């Protein structure tokens, strides 16, 4: 019933993804394909884009009855707050929206450094400013089992999207950080998520757009 | 005693200077100044950065007693919180998170264009789009006062601060929405708002950091 939209990649739509299934939502997915070099094709989507009721029409889009939703964020506090899965008291909104915030710009990082044609140039010192990132993640976390605290929340899934992505550009970004790989894993595990990573419906890849320099494929 | 700080510029701190006149918060500003061309000298900032408290040190950030926050967003929603500021039933909720990014992509689609070294080939085509992206915010809108409704929220400021700096780009972009100037001329009619834009702590201009290319004066 619940019509999750977007391309048929990994990127902004992981996360989202990964809270419907924790959350045992009912939802299908419209699935577009954009077009491969030199045009890059997206008529599939530009053909019902102001079709779909959307007041910002984009990807990803939810529509859920008369609830037709835009913005990746907004689309996840949707979802978390139908099964209490956000921040209750004034400190966990705060940790709340300041990691929101923070996640995205380090996901605004990552994709720059993908999308830029000096790809190569560029990703020395991105892997160089790396661990400074990582390791204010992990000061943050701290012993606690998720980042608002002894409760998963919908940010927890924001935070799995870019950790995770950044160990398969790198492989060993995490290891300084146990705290951070712990987390990773305790994601993985939980019952709902690791069975959705074995069914066929898992989308890992491409992590980004066919525009991509990194992550197209 | 509440502290804000950031660049000696309007930029991100904008919305937050006028929500805070506009709740009567008592605060000081601990204003940066950043060096010309070509060295652009951050040291000032550089200087106290990880001596603040700041779990991920960065500018704008807001120090409230034992309270200490960055990210405009988290400092937007944190002031409206404790003032009644917020969208408060599922349906505000959701047109909160939605404007609130929103109107976050259509400030960086401005800030890349005016950091861009061929601003002056790329502007054309940004004043070419405009109107559409003007045209759904006004949409949104319709015939309520403000953004979420009856009530004024936090949106509202970064709605004014957005479509305002768009007007400073392009003084003739708004002729065509009645309600977005109608909205602006509420917004700087609003008690507190027009007093503080006629004191000499206003700070509108620069628009952005002295690295852009448009509104680095
Ligand atoms: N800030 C928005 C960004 C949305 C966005 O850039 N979507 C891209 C794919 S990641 C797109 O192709 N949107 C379709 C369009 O703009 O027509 C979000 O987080 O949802
Ligand atoms: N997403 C962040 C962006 C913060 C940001 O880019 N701040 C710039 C000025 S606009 C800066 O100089 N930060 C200081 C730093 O990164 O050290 C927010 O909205 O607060």
Redesign the pocket.
């Given at each position: 019933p619940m019509t999750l939209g977007?391309?048929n990649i990994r990127?902004?739509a992981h996360s989202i993804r990964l809270l419907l299934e924790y959350t045992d939502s009912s939802y299908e997915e419209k699935k577009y394909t954009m077009g491969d070099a030199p045009d890059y094709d997206?008529s599939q989507?530009?053909n019902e884009?102001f079709k779909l009721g959307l007041d910002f029409?984009?990807?990803?889009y939810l529509i859920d009855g008369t609830h037709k939703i835009?913005?990746?964020?907004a689309?996840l506090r949707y979802i978390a707050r139908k099964h209490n899965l956000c921040g209750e008291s004034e400190k966990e909104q705060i940790r709340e929206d300041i990691l929101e915030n923070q996640f995205?710009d380090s996901r605004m990082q990552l994709a720059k450094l993908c999308y830029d044609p000096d790809f190569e140039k560029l990703k020395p010192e991105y892997l160089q400013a790396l661990p400074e990132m990582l390791k204010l993640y992990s000061q943050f976390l701290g012993k606690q089992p998720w980042f608002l605290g002894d409760k998963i929340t919908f940010v927890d899934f924001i935070a799995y999207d870019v950790l995770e992505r950044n160990q398969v550009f790198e492989p060993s970004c995490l290891d300084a950080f146990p705290n951070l790989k712990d987390f990773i894993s305790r994601f993985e595990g939980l019952e709902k998520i690791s069975a959705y990573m074995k069914s066929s419906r898992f989308l890992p890849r491409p992590v980004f757009?066919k525009m991509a320099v990194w992550g197209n494929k």
């Open positions: 977007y391309w990127g902004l997206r989507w530009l884009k029409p984009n990807l990803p835009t913005q990746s964020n689309i995205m757009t």
